């Protein structure tokens, strides 16, 4: 048996070297980005956005974020999905983005995921899996984004209920807003301190 290769920080240029196009380094023809909606993608379009704050409350402008999620029917566009259901063929389920250099906001255009089976016949509430990399972060931090308009499903969610301090569960719920017809979920991440976001070892 082998030991897992040890992690190291993404460092100061992680949001540049993994999104070259944005840093005006035009080496690739096809570039990965923060848009998970293709034209025939099914489901309700949503915009997920927010900021990541350090322990002094300041937003990180050098963070790199990726998300992983299921399609509109709660099926993962992955060969490891054992649900026996067909997945939306126009959905990658993954995206990557950095924070705006000035504002510090990050965002993704995606679809609201459907519910995915949990362990031993349970049902998880809709969620998006999120990971954060940056200078000063030695190992990518994993968290999940749940939705405030899914209170009923959130209340029976296995993972959320496995957090014993009920007060911390709320750090994982994004707030729904409606900007001129578009649905936006605001999700702010606090790495350290008061209202510190919950991070998981998965």
């Amino acid at each position: 048996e082998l030991k897992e290769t040890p992690s190291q920080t993404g460092g100061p240029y992680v949001h540049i070297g993994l999104l070259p196009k944005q840093a005006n380094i035009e080496v690739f023809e096809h570039n990965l980005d923060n848009n998970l909606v293709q034209d025939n993608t099914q489901g309700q379009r949503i915009r997920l956005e927010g900021q990541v704050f350090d322990g002094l409350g300041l937003p990180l402008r050098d963070v790199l974020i990726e998300i992983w999620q299921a399609d509109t029917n709660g099926v993962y566009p992955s060969q490891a999905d054992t649900q026996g259901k067909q997945v939306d063929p126009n959905f990658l389920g993954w995206g990557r983005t950095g924070a705006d250099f000035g504002t510090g906001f990050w965002s993704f255009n995606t679809i609201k995921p459907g519910a995915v089976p949990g362990r031993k016949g349970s049902t998880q509430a809709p969620h998006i899996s999120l990971i954060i990399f940056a200078r000063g972060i030695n190992i990518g931090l994993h968290t999940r984004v749940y939705f405030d308009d899914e209170a009923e499903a959130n209340a029976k969610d296995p993972v959320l209920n496995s957090i014993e301090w009920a007060t911390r569960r709320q750090t994982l719920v994004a707030k729904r807003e409606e900007r001129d017809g578009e649905v936006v979920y605001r999700f702010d991440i606090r790495i350290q301190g008061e209202n510190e976001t919950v991070f998981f070892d998965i």
Binding site: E1, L2, K3, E4, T5, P6, S7, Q8, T9, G10, G11, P12, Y13, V14, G17, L18, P20, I25, V27, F28, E29, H30, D54, G55, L56, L60, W68, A70, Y76, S78, Q79, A80, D81, Q83, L92, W94, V116, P117, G118, R119, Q124, H127, I131, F133, R135, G136, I137, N138, I139, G140, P158, V159, I191, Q192, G193, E196, F199, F200, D201, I202
Partner: protein, 238 residues
Amino acid sequence: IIWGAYAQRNTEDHPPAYAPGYKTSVLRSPKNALISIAETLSEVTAPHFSADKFGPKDNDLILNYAKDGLPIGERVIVHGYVRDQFGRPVKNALVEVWQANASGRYRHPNDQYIGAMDPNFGGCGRMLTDDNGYYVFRTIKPGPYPWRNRINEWRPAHIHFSLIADGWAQRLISQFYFEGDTLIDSCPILKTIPSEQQRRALIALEDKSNFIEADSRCYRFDITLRGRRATYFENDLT
């Protein structure tokens, strides 16, 4: 074979979040312990990237941004195998790299180091491992560079790498170094890793028989990701 969950990440084999000697970690590390969860479909799945999307020079950092000439610096090939902890090859994993040029300068306005920029070097590459978990790319050896942790801090030469493989739980970003670099023993970032055997796991080894005469040197570097266990009794994943 019915697959179960990924083996638990061994926290002692990785740096801790809070590591005072790497100053930027002090305000960017959670004060609460991470909450461990039992894995679900969410954690054992991951995206697929099709080969069709990659260009022919995506793994050739020497030519993929060359405009009027070749970049300046030491021509090197880096190759190796990606396997899981139980020794199985990791197939069709997305491996991305980024690095500085021969002067230790990154190609971004944010990098103000006096080391000279190279108009023919970009410093980004990517590839998919093959069926044996093999990967190979070509590049210019990066130069070490100063940074401000203590005022005279210097990173050993390194190439940053990222892997997206079969399960989200395997997601990993790290950095590898080159055999013999004397800065390796002084780096506060490498020293966040607790054990010496794991620090050595990030050192790419000179592979002399694989140098290409009158052309390039070669380094060997293998990567290990978390492995899934098989299930023979109850399958609780679902």
